[PDB]
Design an enzyme around this catalytic site. Structure first.
Site, short mmCIF file in Angstrom:
data_model
loop_
_atom_site.label_atom_id
_atom_site.label_comp_id
_atom_site.label_asym_id
_atom_site.label_seq_id
_atom_site.Cartn_x
_atom_site.Cartn_y
_atom_site.Cartn_z
N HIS A 60 63.08 53.45 57.73
CA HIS A 60 64.48 53.06 58.03
C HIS A 60 64.80 51.57 57.93
O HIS A 60 65.97 51.19 58.00
CB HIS A 60 64.92 53.59 59.39
CG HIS A 60 63.98 53.26 60.49
ND1 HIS A 60 62.97 54.12 60.88
CD2 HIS A 60 63.90 52.19 61.32
CE1 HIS A 60 62.30 53.58 61.88
NE2 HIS A 60 62.85 52.42 62.18
N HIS A 86 63.80 42.60 61.31
CA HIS A 86 64.00 43.56 60.26
C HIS A 86 65.39 43.41 59.67
O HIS A 86 66.21 42.62 60.17
CB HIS A 86 63.78 44.97 60.84
CG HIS A 86 64.76 45.30 61.90
ND1 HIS A 86 64.54 44.99 63.22
CD2 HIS A 86 66.04 45.72 61.82
CE1 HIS A 86 65.61 45.27 63.92
NE2 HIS A 86 66.53 45.74 63.09
N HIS A 88 69.00 45.21 57.58
CA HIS A 88 69.89 46.32 57.22
C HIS A 88 70.68 45.91 55.98
O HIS A 88 71.15 44.78 55.89
CB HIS A 88 70.86 46.64 58.37
CG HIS A 88 70.20 46.94 59.68
ND1 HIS A 88 69.96 48.23 60.10
CD2 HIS A 88 69.73 46.13 60.65
CE1 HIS A 88 69.37 48.19 61.28
NE2 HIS A 88 69.23 46.93 61.64
N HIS A 111 68.11 41.09 61.86
CA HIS A 111 67.96 41.14 63.31
C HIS A 111 66.60 40.66 63.74
O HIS A 111 65.60 41.19 63.27
CB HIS A 111 68.10 42.56 63.80
CG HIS A 111 69.46 43.11 63.61
ND1 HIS A 111 69.70 44.46 63.60
CD2 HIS A 111 70.66 42.51 63.43
CE1 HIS A 111 70.99 44.67 63.40
NE2 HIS A 111 71.59 43.50 63.31
N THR A 192 70.84 49.63 67.83
CA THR A 192 71.69 50.30 66.84
C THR A 192 71.02 51.50 66.23
O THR A 192 71.54 52.08 65.27
CB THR A 192 72.12 49.36 65.71
OG1 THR A 192 70.98 49.05 64.90
CG2 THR A 192 72.74 48.09 66.26
N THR A 193 69.82 51.83 66.71
CA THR A 193 69.17 53.08 66.32
C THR A 193 68.62 53.68 67.60
O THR A 193 68.53 52.98 68.61
CB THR A 193 67.98 52.86 65.36
OG1 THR A 193 66.93 52.21 66.05
CG2 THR A 193 68.36 52.06 64.10
N1 LIG Z 1 68.74 47.57 65.02
S1 LIG Z 1 68.25 46.92 66.40
O1 LIG Z 1 67.88 45.52 66.33
O2 LIG Z 1 69.30 47.09 67.36
C1 LIG Z 1 66.94 47.79 66.94
C2 LIG Z 1 66.87 49.18 66.96
C3 LIG Z 1 65.67 49.63 67.55
C4 LIG Z 1 64.86 48.58 67.95
C5 LIG Z 1 63.55 48.56 68.67
C6 LIG Z 1 62.72 49.59 69.09
N2 LIG Z 1 61.75 48.90 69.73
C7 LIG Z 1 60.62 49.28 70.37
C8 LIG Z 1 59.38 48.63 70.21
C9 LIG Z 1 58.21 48.94 70.91
C10 LIG Z 1 58.19 49.94 71.86
C11 LIG Z 1 59.36 50.65 72.13
C12 LIG Z 1 59.31 51.66 73.08
C13 LIG Z 1 60.47 52.37 73.38
C14 LIG Z 1 61.67 52.10 72.71
C15 LIG Z 1 61.76 51.09 71.75
C16 LIG Z 1 60.64 50.35 71.42
N3 LIG Z 1 61.97 47.53 69.76
N4 LIG Z 1 63.17 47.33 69.06
S2 LIG Z 1 65.56 47.03 67.67
ZN LIG Z 2 68.54 46.20 63.48
#
Ligand SMILES: NS(=O)(=O)c1ccc(-c2cn(-c3cccc4ccccc34)nn2)s1
Ligand SMILES: [Zn+2]
EC number: 4.2.1.1
Length: 251
Positions: A60, A86, A88, A111, A192-193
């Site tokens: 993704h 990462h 988008h 991001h 956002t995911t």
């Molecule tokens: N697109 S975004 O920057 O909002 C973004 C979307 C999902 C993200 C994410 C997930 N992460 C995780 C890393 C390590 C362990 C985790 C455990 C549970 C949930 C998220 C975790 N850290 N950032 S960052």
């Molecule tokens: Zn992101």
């Protein structure tokens, strides 16, 4: 979970149906000027070439794992450590930024995800106020090859397959961001995911980062995602502010 199809994200994580989600459409006339928003501060972002960093096609996005010791402060007493960054993006003649400005979608977005120094682990920070902070910058087309981005983009062919990774030398991570750390929007939202946890402090730079046309094409036309599909248009639709007021560090 995936972009563009099932499972429905609220089924994966109920927090994806929260009232206060990201990304959002920034309408800067409705932004609130807030002079307590001072310039962002970054320490340890200028890395030596060794040890190398891991760059992964996770199906993704393309994600660069950041080493320990990257400190970021949103202001005095608002301290974070960088975990990863990462991207988008869209597709041929289709922009794919997550955030929009007055409805304008930008070619791509970076991001850089951070963990509050009050938490040892991301999963303890999830959903806690200010537990996680993300720096976001739009990527636009410029005339020159962006040398910091070229270090990542030149390696995407190696990680074309979903689930593949490669090692890259350390670089100046702050060179993937705009030089203007003074002018930015800031609001509270979500990942956002999935799991789309809330309590995330979003900081979105006024200034954009410039990549060449060739670089933008490389980003959007090189990686493959779930099944036999190109990894493209990997952005979430904008989410209503629902009463939240975006702050701006400028009038
Ligand atoms: N697109 S975004 O920057 O909002 C973004 C979307 C999902 C993200 C994410 C997930 N992460 C995780 C890393 C390590 C362990 C985790 C455990 C549970 C949930 C998220 C975790 N850290 N950032 S960052
Ligand atoms: Zn992101």
């Amino acid at each position: 979970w995936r972009y563009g199809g099932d499972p429905p994200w609220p089924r994966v994580s109920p927090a994806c149906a929260g009232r206060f989600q990201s990304p959002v459409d920034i309408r800067p006339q409705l932004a609130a000027f807030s002079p307590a928003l001072r310039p962002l501060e970054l320490l340890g972002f200028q890395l030596p070439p060794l040890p190398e960093l891991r760059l992964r096609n996770n199906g993704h996005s393309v994600q660069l794992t950041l080493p320990p010791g990257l400190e970021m402060a949103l202001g005095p007493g608002r301290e974070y450590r960088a975990l990863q960054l990462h991207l988008h993006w869209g597709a041929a003649g289709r922009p794919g930024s997550e955030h929009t400005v007055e409805g304008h979608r930008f070619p791509a977005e970076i991001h850089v995800v951070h963990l509050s120094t009050a938490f040892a682990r991301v999963d303890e920070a999830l959903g806690r106020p200010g537990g996680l902070a993300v720096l976001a910058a739009f990527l636009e087309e410029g005339p020159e090859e962006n040398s910091a981005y070229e270090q990542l983009l030149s390696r995407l062919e190696e990680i074309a397959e979903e689930g593949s990774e490669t090692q890259v030398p350390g670089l100046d991570i702050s060179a993937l961001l705009p030089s203007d750390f003074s002018r930015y929007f800031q609001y509270e939202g979500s990942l956002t995911t999935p799991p789309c946890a809330q309590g995330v402090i979003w900081t979105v730079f006024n200034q954009t980062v410039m990549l060449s046309a060739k670089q933008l094409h490389t980003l959007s036309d090189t990686l493959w995602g779930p099944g036999d599909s190109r990894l493209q248009l990997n952005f979430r639709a904008t989410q209503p502010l629902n009463g939240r007021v975006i702050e701006a560090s400028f009038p």
